[PDB]
Structure 1
Amino acid sequence: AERLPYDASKWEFPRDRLKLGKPLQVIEADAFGIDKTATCRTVAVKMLKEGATHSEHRALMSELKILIHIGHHLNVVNLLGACTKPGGPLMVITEFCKFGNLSTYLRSKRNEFVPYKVAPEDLYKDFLTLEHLICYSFQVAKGMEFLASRKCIHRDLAARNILLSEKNVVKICDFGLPLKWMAPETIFDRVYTIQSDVWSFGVLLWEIFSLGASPYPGVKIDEEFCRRLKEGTRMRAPDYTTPEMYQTMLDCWHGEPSQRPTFSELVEHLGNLLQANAQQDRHHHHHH
């Protein structure tokens, strides 16, 4: 629905308080006074091109309203304000994640990975570890549990739509071959649901534990691909996975949408795996 309310007094931001920067249309920019926390803050802006159809305007507006309605969550790009009143183009302003999409970031740390650290820890400064990977998965799962709980369906959950912020905090965003993230029922029936988002999460898991690889490596995405997918064929375990994570991937990819775990179960499961890994890490650190 678009019937959602827009509270101008709370969200409206003056267009001349922004200084548009480079493209990420989604642009990066400097916003002055959008925060009572400072005077100048870097932010991201999604705006309508100068052409923009009337229906295209209504679309960006509905996204804005949904962002307002949903609310704040540490693992979802948070809305900061908007320019909707007459005088300029419609603009939606959110926090900025300087490190970019998770896929690209993981791709750049392939030579900087160890399963876990021990002394001397300095030999692994800013390296990725199993803790990091499971932690990104845990956060995205909490973000999705947050959205599913509000009847909000992503429709394009993939590593490219996950942003990396400071302190290894990841956020779910939406820049809005994509068939590779789509569940069987989405491809053959054009059905989108929380469950089909669970399928996508599984593919995201694979991406995270392959360190930014492209799903279904060396496979043409044609009719055979879709046929085999519906028939039960699945990607093999990626290079940096743990046995439990791979099985969570298989669970997410179950043929029956209703047999896949819910995001609450995944949040619960990933949480336990995160603690087990951490406990294991303490022993590895202590003994060596």
Structure 2
Amino acid sequence: EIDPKDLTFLKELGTGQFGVVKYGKWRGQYDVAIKMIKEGSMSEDEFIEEAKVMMNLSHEKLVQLYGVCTKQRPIFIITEYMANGCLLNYLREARHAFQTQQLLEMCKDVCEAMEYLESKQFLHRDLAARNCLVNDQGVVKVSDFGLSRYVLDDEYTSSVGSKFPVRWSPPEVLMYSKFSSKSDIWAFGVLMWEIYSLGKMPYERFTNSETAEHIAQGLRLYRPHLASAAVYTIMYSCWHEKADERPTFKILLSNILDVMDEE
């Protein structure tokens, strides 16, 4: 529990699932982002109990939760500040003119964070470039892990909803609501595709309904031009029709390190 007297609000960063997020300072020293949770958007009491677990998740490639303010409304969620914003928008800016080694390092940043979450048996459930952030050093960190569980908007949480992450979901999620470690693995492979595609929409010529059909047929995303055969093999391994045949994040990390050494 952070004392709100130790927060200063300085500029708006944008609006997400829970409303406005601001940039500010904590204890007159530390940059933070502060979510102001919009009334009616969150299952608040359930989140407040989970915040304890989520504060114990600490890894250099996870956007750190610093604390919450819950003895007031709106609730605040105070997190690490990531100066370069969302990875999706970052990938889409041609001025960065990334080398493929930089793209692979972004995949490795995310894979490290997800290997850590997997070790804690903790699912993200909405892993995608839009839910990763980039700091002032160009390090990519995974954000908003686990928070999908507290979203009250049915257009986001229902599989048939307009906001559901269809293009990052395996067939067993879309058909059966089967969530597991292996559904985050599937999403990771789509995220690698997004990175190597410089932020294209997965299945860019299909609708959500068509994508669900295409993947139920065994067909997959094509190799982005910037991906080598070895990088494509890694992302494609995340898309096995049988969940238990998909790698763990530990194996993915080893594969990524091998490609960095080879290429």
TM-score (norm 1): 0.78
| Paired residue type of 1:203 | V
Q: How does 1:14-93 map to 2 (within 5 A)?
A: 14-20=3-9, 21-24=11-14, 25-33=19-27, 39-49=28-38, 51-52=39-40, 56-70=43-57, 72-85=58-71, 87-93=72-78
Q: Does 1:143 align with 2:113?
A: yes
| Paired residue type of 2:12 | K
Q: Does 1:98 align with 2:83?
A: yes
- Structure 1 residue 26: deviation in Å? 4.5
1:179 paired residue among 161, 166, 174: 166
4+ residue segments displaced more than 4 Å: none
| Paired residue type of 1:57 | E
| Paired residue type of 1:199 | W
- Structure 1 residue 188: deviation in Å? 0.3
> 2:101 aligns to what?
131
What's the RMSD between the two structures over aligned residues? 1.9
- Structure 1 residue 184: deviation in Å? 0.5
Counterpart contact for 1:18–1:29, Cα < 8 Å: no
| Paired residue type of 1:148 | E
> 2:129 aligns to what?
159
2:198 paired residue among 208, 211, 219: 211
Q: Does 1:220 align with 2:207?
A: yes
- Structure 1 residue 48: deviation in Å? 2.3
- Structure 1 residue 255: deviation in Å? 0.3
Structure 1 residues 132 and 47, CA, compared in 2 at 3 Å: closer, same or farther? same
Measure, in 1, the Cα distance between the counterparts of 2:178 and 2:214: 19
Q: Does 1:271 align with 2:261?
A: no
Measure, in 2, the Cα distance between the counterparts of 1:157 and 1:94: 18
| Paired residue type of 1:45 | I
Structure 1 residues 16 and 112, CA, compared in 2 at 3 Å: closer, same or farther? closer
Q: Deviations over 1:100-156 (max 9, x none)?
A: 1111101003x543xxxxxxxxxxxxxx11111110101100100000110100111
Measure, in 2, the Cα distance between the counterparts of 1:42 and 1:112: 24
Structure 1 residues 191 and 62, CA, compared in 2 at 3 Å: closer, same or farther? farther
Q: Which runs of 5+ in 1 are unaligned?
A: 1-11, 34-38, 114-127, 278-288
TM-score (norm 2): 0.85
Q: Which runs of 5+ in 2 are unaligned?
A: 149-162
Measure, in 2, the Cα distance between the counterparts of 1:102 and 1:134: 14
Larger Rg: 1
- Structure 1 residue 27: deviation in Å? 1.4
> 1:252 aligns to what?
238
- Structure 1 residue 259: deviation in Å? 0.5
Counterpart contact for 2:55–2:67, Cα < 8 Å: no
> 1:190 aligns to what?
177
SS in 1 for 2:208: coil
- Structure 1 residue 40: deviation in Å? 2.5
Q: What is the total number of aligned residue pairs between the two structures?
A: 241
Percent of matched pairs sharing the same residue? 32
